[model samples]
Target: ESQPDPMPDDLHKSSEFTGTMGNMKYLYDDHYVSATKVKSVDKFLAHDLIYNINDKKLNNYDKVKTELLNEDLANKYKDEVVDVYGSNYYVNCYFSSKDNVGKVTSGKTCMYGGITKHEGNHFDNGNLQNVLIRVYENKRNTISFEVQTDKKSVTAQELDIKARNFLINKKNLYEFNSSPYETGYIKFIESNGNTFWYDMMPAPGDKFDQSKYLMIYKDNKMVDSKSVKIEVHLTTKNG
Candidate 1:
């Protein structure tokens, strides 16, 4: 639940993403924007983003086959996902090449999940390096995302920012009457029934060691603040 920008469930926001372990290379606004080590890229795709694997490849997941992890649960989701038809229950995708043409081939094989390359060619990792997006959609039109990395939920840092804004906006805190420079040293926190922040002030040249995540900004001088009570624990991973 790391709060990054939500991927809009539309084709316009969908872009090609190549990956071995993380997502990369997407064109937006005519400019290719990419980041290193960012994992969970697309979960909002109801339209084609990369791989034409899911039914949404052409449209929302109305055409792709849905297989349940548990056979007993197959009918369980029937009420959730409709238009069930019996037939080929497997798909295989693999890389292939020929004169001036290098592409992938996907079809039904053993009615299971696998891939098939040209005659004798073996399926290698980098063979299919081209970008592809895969998502699962139900009959309800709800889309399930495919992410290459694990995600964390909740963050301890949110508490500080939330309390900071609460005081700044709710209370007309502007400038300090005595120590105007101290405004830059306040750190937001919550204790007891009141909202608070640390009043840790360091001289201009005598910097604090935690400057990487430290805050230095002007805040209201009304009731300056922190004992730190709220405990929001979480973690993050680079894609």
Candidate 2:
């Protein structure tokens, strides 16, 4: 069975940044890494599910149950638990079901595991490698995770250029107030008439604005905006 390698303890040394976001602890390296686990399942069922899915024969929940539980297919899998992974990098968003309706149900259901990594052409794209998430039952009691990376490492200067280009393209300008690893807050004013503040550590900190003018856009049109005022203080003492 295919399985992902175990995460290394020295992950922080390789990663550009590391922090906890909600329940997931993430690392930004050549690729994104999240130290999390998934429920394991029998090898046969996993292989069968994927095959039926790729063959386009998995029409609904009932169809899956029948195909997965078939005596012949079950025998083929040999009833061993295994690790599986899937990536959805190029799939465009699509509307699958008719009627704009949705509901959340309570109870156990099979969930497919998936990973996401975003590449190219997006502003605020620092989180280039996206989250790895999936759904599965906890009955198997086995856990596993995966690691994927780019061939080349991305430097802070490269990311800085991207950030500057993003801001300039939006006609915004501001000065960043500190050295690397200094944590601070960013105030956002939306054209939709909403304002808020987000606290974060600046990567390549010198490139971002300390306080600056931000243009709010709605439907690609500049509607409203505001300027920010920020002060930096250095601490010292004299006797």
Candidate 3:
């Protein structure tokens, strides 16, 4: 096997200003340090280079971003959910559909998600995975939910019950009297759209975006981590 290329020696410290984009001076100083779970340290990671996604050397810059946004990165906002990894690092995002089309009564049918993280050329890529979105809608049609996650082992049945019980136990005005089944207004995803990236709803806290999934490197060794939060939402539509 071809050994992985070594990262920069100064990756642990300082900033390497690369360029600028629209009032933002682009610098390569992104790092993540977490003190949570596992002895309050790295379930995941800490103080490590998180991105370097640009370079005239790797690939065309605007091409990657444009493809990602218009196509490669075309998702985000509203009650909908879109989470991404390695945002500022140089890699082209590729997506795929791995399940039958979802329906009003399709029960437990699941789709396989395919994504490739490639740094070379946008035309070709890497062998990585995507998500296990368990889609469902109640008989009333007023209630629906999608479990966006990488937990492939979790069944749609489990997500169904999970979403149902979630509101049953925890509700807000957003849930229309704490229940969608009884709501007069329609609150469900209608269609799925193109793959894209957007600013996801931030995790709430006492003046900070709290880490729902904390992480850190242990002795220069990358840990097996699942920093991506397995999310549950009341929406869909990828365009």
Candidate 4:
């Protein structure tokens, strides 16, 4: 007699599952003594730097928004923000007209101070990326993982036992370590206990090459996992 298929209850949900932001307004506002004051605090506190101004000359919100929305300025800002914030107070602050006006209108209130403090480290420390895996139905499976940087896709692959290994290796190599003059590699071990290695150095623009998917088999079924990398940076001291 054939064995009955295992129930879906046997599958475990990913701990990394994040909830979606509904119509809830994620708006935040805060105040500082001056542009230099914001920079000083953010530098020591690890916050995303953002600024708000109505100068029309320096406060080019339209241009900045356009560049952040459609160009590579967002990524460029990431690298520059880290250097200024000391990898600690790298909070993701938006220099919007609302936030800027709120700061002046609301007795210089620091509206999203709590959220900024909590998310600052995650954004600046470079540990916020999604991962992907591929699973095959039978004993053999193949999975590919990929990350997008500056309009390019980076990918890598791993089998059964090497699945977690590949993840850890890749995360360490590509996530942090911002020295432009340094090089690194990622190593992994497969189900058969065989070791593998891949280059983990950033190329011309500090970007990963490409990663393949990861595959796994559980309860007589195959599954795949995938993820994307997100890096957030901002400067608010000058606002």
Candidate 5:
């Protein structure tokens, strides 16, 4: 006997954008630095520095002197600055008597200008090699698709209810039998006039081919539709 199928309304969808994971190394003269965990220094400058440096300790005379004189310590303070203020040039030093001692703070204020010689290299290189992971929420009663950068459109035909149900239930966008890569699955809901589409790319090590699947659904039954194959051509800079 065939196993019971999962209800269409019980399925969910989610996605993410992830960067390549590995150690990155850079050389400056004889100093060899390997970034095992390179972070987006620009993002840090935009959101982390300004908020953290507001504390009383960072504004103290002893702390200020200590931060400026020591290279490692200065780098740490510079990190703090970028972390709080963001990846901009900030060079506004002012004395405020509101606290017990005069609060002296100095830095540039723009994301582009706030970075110093020592920190600038980190920011420039970090951005070039950074990876972003975007996770999407998966929920019941909705299907999603991701179209490939190469393909413009996709089509499906002759789908029965069972085959439609199977396609909708199979969330694996990379699975060719249930779902196809480069093109995604779609689901239609009649109650609220809701129709959703999801497109996906092949997983790593999977062949990048242009092909389409047809789904046939009728009278609460579903079946596979006819197959259509196509080729994708990419433009080069010379062309």
Candidate 6:
């Protein structure tokens, strides 16, 4: 989950800013200020930070999408919809213009043990480049996991930096952190249990050499890392 700093009930000691936006008088002064005033100012600063960071990330993601995605192919499927789990359970299934990853979101289904579900797919040109597993959790305290290709591995933070760098960079998407369950892009994965089997995707321009799907533990250590021949894409044509 993309963790945003939660607004403390009281001003956090580490907060960089101390003043409200419109008030220039008490710009840096916080001592002796009204309790209400201080709280409002704190909330304002937190909101400003969130807005600024989200804007920065959105801009970076746009650049990443351009290089890693096939814009032309995505256009054709922009308005396309599908029944992700079948039976009149239709939902918008298309490539994201900003993230440029194919997505399908079926908001809460009633198919027995069903819940709100969504999925992602990375595409380039006419080929489906990679498949992403955004949500997968069981009765395990999986804090986070890593996605290793070949023998090389990358963590969520490293991947995020790369993604920003792509503007311009983790695990298999599902993350269990104090923050909200990440919906859009899976910037990080929080893992702590047994290795889970899932496919992998490479960052932009990196050669998918000896490309194989594998897993790693949250201890920043490789566990069941193995090289196995695997299929990379699902066939889909636009005629």
| Cα lDDT tens digits for candidate 2, 1-239 | 12222132311120132322211111111211111122223232332332122212222221111113244433443333322222111111112233132313211112222211122222243333321211111222122212222212221122222223232223221222221222223233333434343223333322322111111110111111122111111111110
- lDDT, model 3, position 229: 19
Candidate 2: give the clashing pairs: 43-80, 44-77, 175-209, 175-210
lDDT of 5 by residue, 1-239 (tens): 13222343332221221222110000001111111112223222212212222223233221111112124433443444222111111122222334232223542121111112223323332332211111222322243322121111112211111222233335332232322222223332222333333222222232221111111110111111112221111111122
Alpha carbon deviation, residue 200, candidate 3 (Å): 4.3
Query: Count of backbone clashes for each model?
Result: 12, 4, 26, 47, 52, 11
For candidate 1, write residues 21-126 as lDDT tens digits. Answer: 0110000011111111212222112211111233322222222332223333333332231121111221221122231322133331111111111222212342
Candidate 4 lDDT score relative to the true structure: 0.23
As for TM-score, the candidate ahead, 3 or 5, is 3
- The alpha-carbon deviation from the true structure for residue 186 of candidate 1, after best TM-score superposition, in angstroms, is 8.0
Encode model 6's per-residue lDDT on 97-141: one tens digit a residue: 342332343221110000011122111232322212222222223
C-alpha TM-score for every candidate: 0.18, 0.17, 0.18, 0.17, 0.16, 0.16
lDDT score, candidate 1, position 84:
18
Model 6 ranges off by over 4 Å: 1-152, 169-187, 191-239
Worst 10 residues of 1 by lDDT: 21-30
lDDT of 6 at 126: 27
Q: Number of clashes in model 1?
A: 12
Q: What ranges in model 2 sit over 4 Å off?
A: 1-181, 202-239
Instruction: Give per-residue CA lDDT, model 3, range 1-239, as digits (tens).
Output: 12222232312110122111111111111211111111111111111111212233433332111112122122211112222122121111221233333222211111111112222212123322232223223222333333343332222222322333343344321221112321111111212311211111112222211111111101111111122112233222221
Candidate 4, after superposition: displacement of residue 123 in Å? 21
